[PDB]
Design a protein around this ligand. Structure first.
Ligand code: HEC
Ligand code: HEC
Ligand code: HEC
Ligand code: HEC
Ligand SMILES: [Ca+2]
Ligand SMILES: [Ca+2]
Ligand SMILES: [Ca+2]
Ligand SMILES: [Zn+2]
Ligand SMILES: [Zn+2]
Ligand SMILES: [Zn+2]
Ligand SMILES: [Zn+2]
Ligand SMILES: [Zn+2]
Ligand SMILES: [Zn+2]
Ligand SMILES: [Zn+2]
Ligand SMILES: [Zn+2]
Ligand SMILES: [Zn+2]
Ligand SMILES: [Zn+2]
Lengths: 106, 106, 106, 106
């Protein structure tokens, strides 16, 4: 979609995970989160509406999204294990990845 | 795309890599594969069309893609490292994931 | 302990997963493979005795163990979920990393 | 190495990264973080002396080191690629994993 939906989607589901009662929601929340980051891998962002698809600023923008998927893929294992709290921890801990990309690219 | 389209995409570029002279042909191919990977797991493979989206078979089907997506990423760092060769052997190596998913869920 | 020593615990603990009946044994093998891969990452292989600790191939050699390690890490998460079948097929996929390394430096 | 040593190595090798001129410094600083993180996996901590080797606290304590390696594993390719700025950024991102373990386990 629009990058902003994806981002809102990511963000919404973060709060959802912050607030979530159990594994059930965390699981779908992360399922939701992962499709969107994946959907965002391909977009050419406002700040980099300039340079071409293969350059050290459109590669490193894109690499930030694999950091993100792996960390979603970890929490989802934790969310699967019946370990809500330690999976909600992992969800909090991707805010650091959210911010790093943001700092160079937003 | 639907599942089949992504799967040709995955196979066409796995071919590209095998013949690629240089790192740039590898990077672009592996870039196409990643999106094809993350598009593909939103699909319901015929073999499991019956089963519910939330189901052991179907959560494992989706998990296979993270494994492919992690691999392409690493393979893509080796493509950004100028190391033309080891990226191909890394890509070849991921045929194992392809085969494993196909051995169970095709 | 040393390389030839470490590889047997890998080779042996690989064998214990292939036949296992419950999680604990698999969880149990997987963590020694990691220690065995913790222990083995530091060492120097007979094919690279001449090479400096900052050589390309020694870096490419330590790399193999991370891939192997990264797979063990995920393979442990499925065991933790009790998914015995999946954890046996995941451990099976490790041979691809085992074999990738041996072509080059064993 | 022991836990206190391994931590010292992590903390100093990071600070080396923060202050780095080049890429081969960061390459070498991260490698010693990886050696130390590998090595701390087998240590049992002052908060969990009372806890058993295969237990929820110790399995999840060893998992903290599995995360960190991956971020360390990933930090090297940026560095390897002469990508100093963004390798340092991946080193600042380790602090979220650093902190995560301490809150739960120090
Ligand atoms: C780069 C690789 C990013 C990662 C990883 C994440 N975000 Fe993002 N985000 C990114 C950009 C370039 C932008 C700007 C889009 C724009 O409006 O021009 C954003 C934006 C947001 C927003 C605000 C959207 C808006 O309407 O302005 C939010 C709320 C947001 N991002 C949240 C968010 C969260 C929670 C993330 C991790 C879970 C995350 N982002 C990752 C780039 C990147
Ligand atoms: C599951 C997690 C899969 C992974 C990983 C890969 N593939 Fe796949 N592939 C998968 C399914 C379920 C199917 C069947 C599609 C159908 O409905 O018929 C396929 C199919 C293919 C095909 C042929 C498509 C067809 O006509 O049926 C090809 C050429 C193919 N897959 C290639 C391929 C490659 C190269 C992969 C890794 C790089 C790969 N697949 C991974 C499921 C999964
Ligand atoms: C490099 C990154 C490696 C990975 C990953 C694995 N192995 Fe290995 N192995 C490696 C080297 C360099 C050597 C030779 C070193 C020496 O001096 O012995 C080996 C050797 C073995 C052997 C031979 C032991 C013997 O009978 O003499 C075995 C059986 C072996 N390796 C098994 C093995 C398995 C099962 C792995 C994955 C699970 C694996 N190795 C990974 C280098 C690397
Ligand atoms: C668990 C998975 C950990 C990770 C990841 C990191 N650290 Fe750690 N650290 C951990 C424990 C259990 C302890 C206390 C152990 C003890 O016996 O003291 C520590 C301690 C430290 C210290 C303090 C040294 C002291 O005065 O006792 C420092 C400075 C430290 N840790 C730094 C550090 C850094 C920089 C890390 C990431 C880059 C990091 N730690 C990760 C457990 C874990
Ligand atoms: Ca077809
Ligand atoms: Ca098409
Ligand atoms: Ca000491
Ligand atoms: Zn994990
Ligand atoms: Zn089509
Ligand atoms: Zn079609
Ligand atoms: Zn069509
Ligand atoms: Zn085609
Ligand atoms: Zn790598
Ligand atoms: Zn011996
Ligand atoms: Zn996994
Ligand atoms: Zn030690
Ligand atoms: Zn990366």
């Amino acid at each position: 979609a629009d990058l902003e939906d994806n981002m809102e989607t990511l963000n919404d589901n973060l709060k959802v995970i912050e607030k979530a009662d159990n594994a059930a929601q965390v699981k779908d929340a992360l399922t939701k989160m992962a499709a969107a980051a994946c959907d965002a891998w391909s977009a050419t962002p406002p700040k980099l509406e300039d340079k071409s698809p293969d350059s050290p600023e459109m590669h490193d923008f894109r690499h930030g999204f694999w950091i993100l998927i792996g960390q979603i893929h970890d929490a989802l294992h934790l969310a699967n294990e019946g370990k809500v709290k330690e999976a909600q921890a992992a969800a909090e801990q991707l805010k650091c990845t959210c911010n790093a990309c943001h700092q160079k690219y937003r």
